Design a protein around this ligand. Sequence first.
Ligand SMILES: *[C@@H]1O[C@H](CO)[C@@H](O[C@@H]2O[C@H](CO)[C@@H](O)[C@H](O)[C@H]2NC(C)=O)[C@H](O)[C@H]1NC(C)=O
Ligand SMILES: *[C@@H]1O[C@H](CO)[C@@H](O)[C@H](O)[C@H]1NC(C)=O
Ligand SMILES: *[C@@H]1O[C@H](CO)[C@@H](O)[C@H](O)[C@H]1NC(C)=O
Lengths: 53, 522, 65
Amino acid sequence: RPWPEAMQLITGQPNMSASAMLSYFKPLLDWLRTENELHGEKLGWPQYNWTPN
Amino acid sequence: EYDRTSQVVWNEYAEANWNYNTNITTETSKILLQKNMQIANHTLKYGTQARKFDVNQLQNTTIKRIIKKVQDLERAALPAQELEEYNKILLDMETTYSVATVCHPNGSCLQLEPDLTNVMATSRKYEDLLWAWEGWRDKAGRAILQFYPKYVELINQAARLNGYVDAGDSWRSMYETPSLEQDLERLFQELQPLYLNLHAYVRRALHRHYGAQHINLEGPIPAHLLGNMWAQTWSNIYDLVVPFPSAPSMDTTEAMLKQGWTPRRMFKEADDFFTSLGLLPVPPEFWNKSMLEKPTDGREVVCHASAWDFYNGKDFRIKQCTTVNLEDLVVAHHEMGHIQYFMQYKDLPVALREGANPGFHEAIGDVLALSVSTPKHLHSLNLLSSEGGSDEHDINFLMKMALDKIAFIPFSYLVDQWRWRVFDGSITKENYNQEWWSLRLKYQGLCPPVPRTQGDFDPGAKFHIPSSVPYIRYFVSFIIQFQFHEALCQAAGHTGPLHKCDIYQSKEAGQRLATAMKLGFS
Amino acid sequence: HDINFLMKMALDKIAFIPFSYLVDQWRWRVFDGSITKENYNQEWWSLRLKYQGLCPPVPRTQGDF
Ligand SMILES: *[C@@H]1O[C@H](CO)[C@@H](O[C@@H]2O[C@H](CO)[C@@H](O)[C@H](O)[C@H]2NC(C)=O)[C@H](O)[C@H]1NC(C)=O
Ligand SMILES: *[C@@H]1O[C@H](CO)[C@@H](O)[C@H](O)[C@H]1NC(C)=O
Ligand SMILES: *[C@@H]1O[C@H](CO)[C@@H](O)[C@H](O)[C@H]1NC(C)=O
């Protein structure tokens, strides 16, 4: 049988959901955001044309 | 009814545009603003009226084409607030780019069009070229970046309500070609070998001049060591890349100085050549009603624009003024061709008064400039060149002429490739600049002279980026205009060295051109 | 303890999510002719910098793959 039927069989929704990862890592995500703002740092890589040597 | 009302409303719009362009003030800005509001209202009303119609069940071609072309509201499909914000964003971007001037804080300042472009096209110092390019890119791009995401979002919204997909399909539907992207990619791949050889020679010459500290044999040439602010048509000043300096090589820098050579008489010469080709002349009031020279004050025009037609069937003016130069001749011939293209389909309805394809405009504008740039035509006009007698002069002329019309093909592909990639959501905001340099390292052979971090909206230097014009219409021209010349040189009765063939009093060639270019968009 | 364990498992898995999305994207683009042969490494490193945010520690020239 196709993939969606099995995916519903294990879980219940025939869709690939990324919310499970987010809820799994929610405490770490919150703590890490708090630490990042406390340390005063910017996300991303806004110096993309950078190479150590 | 649409034709009848559109004629007058667009005549008023173009008159207001001229009044702005030649008389830049606050009153002209206000008049253009509220007439833009008026034309947006009229086009929204008539598009909404047309949307009650159906085009498929209609049994005809001309009216079906008119209805299909007027089904879309373009930028008038937005609600009141969204349309107002989009127009304000466009106006603010244009204003902050046109007046954008970068200079040393010591006090002396320079503007883009009059000096900076010239100040690098005549300079050969690494530091000065680097300072000019970096300062302009920094200032203009940083100024534009504050508004550009909003414009992208609003234009995507406008396309989505119009019926297209994220403003890429909207600009690609002007060509009516479902397979446009693949065809253009194939054309660029076919053009790759010659362009690569030219870039190899240019890198050789640049390493010969500047040494090896800045440019090395292996590696792309820096984007600012070429001659232009943007390197679209690089090394148009070829003194550093001359293959072999030859005695009979043309100068074309003094041949228009000791004879006076005012812009008026040179435009008359261009018109005389165009008439000798065998098409209808421009009505005489163009000469005594238009402006084609430097002003009497410090405020003349916007930085750069194109020919202006008032759609009234009487006004076919030209705005460009570039003092006296050889490239002045090529731009003047380009604008002559463009204005005659605007003029030739006067009899067609104003709904189809747009040309067969945005590329064809520049193609027909520039084919005659290509034909007149040959050394034989210059020998027949004010100059004494070797023509085709000496092959060395021929190869030198071919190199001078291929520094343009080639190394512009990759740029004309790249700009609209990047704009399509950013319009269709493939490029996230956070690296708006990065892809633009990656393309510069892939389609062209240029690298950033200084590490260009994010926050430097390097695509903001080009005038065609904030003005919202589809740059790729030039690429097709720079691919198709040559394909035109061949056919025209067929009517001359001889082919021989097609790189030196000339069109002059070839009546059948002009008749063939007119029997098709008159069709317009019908 | 919970934070340390979560950090270890995050390093295990969500540092691998981007590479898994990245390598097959590059291969899909290569197979469909969009990468040709002149620049096999440049597209790969541009994709690395776009998705995973890693830079070549030394200049990786064409011909290294
Ligand atoms: C259907 O198309 C035909 C041409 O295929 C139109 O015929 C001419 O249309 C132009 C405007 O496009 C008019 O100026 C001409 O007068 C028309 N010719 C004649 C002989 O009348 C025709 O008008 C179109 N149908 C409609 C209803 O407009
Ligand atoms: C141009 O603008 C000035 C502003 O002072 C105005 O006096 C002048 O009449 C305008 N020119 C024309 C031809 O309307
Ligand atoms: C445009 O038409 C609308 C119709 O509701 C009207 O409210 C608005 O005032 C018009 N704008 C102008 C500039 O005439």
